[PDB]
Amino acid sequence: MQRGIVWVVDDDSSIRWVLERALAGAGLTCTTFENGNEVLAALASKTPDVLLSDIRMPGMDGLALLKQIKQRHPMLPVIIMTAHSDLDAAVSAYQQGAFDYLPKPFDIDEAVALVERAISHYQE
Numbered sequence: 001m002q003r004g005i006v007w008v009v010d011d012d013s014s015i016r017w018v019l020e021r022a023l024a025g026a027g028l029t030c031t032t033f034e035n036g037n038e039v040l041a042a043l044a045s046k047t048p049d050v051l052l053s054d055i056r057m058p059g060m061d062g063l064a065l066l067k068q069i070k071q072r073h074p075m076l077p078v079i080i081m082t083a084h085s086d087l088d089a090a091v092s093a094y095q096q097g098a099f100d101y102l103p104k105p106f107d108i109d110e111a112v113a114l115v116e117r118a119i120s121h122y123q124e
Contacts, residue, residue, distance in 0.1 A: 004049035004119055007031045009039045009065065010081075011057040015104045022108030028115065035059025036066075043068050049119045052081035052102055055089060062086070070096075077118030081106075 006023050008031065010016065016032055023030035031048065033039055037060045039051070051069070055062030062082065069078055080093050081102045090101045099118050102111060 001116075001120075001123065003028055004115065005029045005031065005046075006115055007039060007042065007048035007051040009033055009036055009051070009059070010054050010104065011035065011059045012104075015106075018105075018108050019111075022112050026112050028112065036061060036064050039065055040068065043072070047073065047076050050077050050079060050099075050115050052079050054082055055080070055086035056082040077121065079114075079118070 006028050008016070008019050010032075011034055020030045020032065022028070031042075033042075035057065036053070043065070047069070053062035053066045053069075055066075062080075066078065069076055074097065077099055079099045079102050080090060081104055083103060093101075100114070102114065
């Protein structure tokens, strides 16, 4: 309902700036690493309110990371974020139980509200 965890794994300072500039400014918990690999160590420990997996970056990938949140506990809200590459998953994801497609670059202005959009579904 108010504030929450925000994990964004991507390889780009351009998307990391606007992102951290939105959360840190909105009081939302800002979190970043680089590739799904890093997020893994954090995933096994806890689960964010919403993450934007990336399937098109020099870091690692989005399948290896999504395979955890999907297997470990797919009940959590997840959003697919990437470019034309691997965009085919944008469809299958929906049938699998995806939330939406927030490709980058994007406007954090809309993301800030989209972050809670899913969290609400699991209102405590």
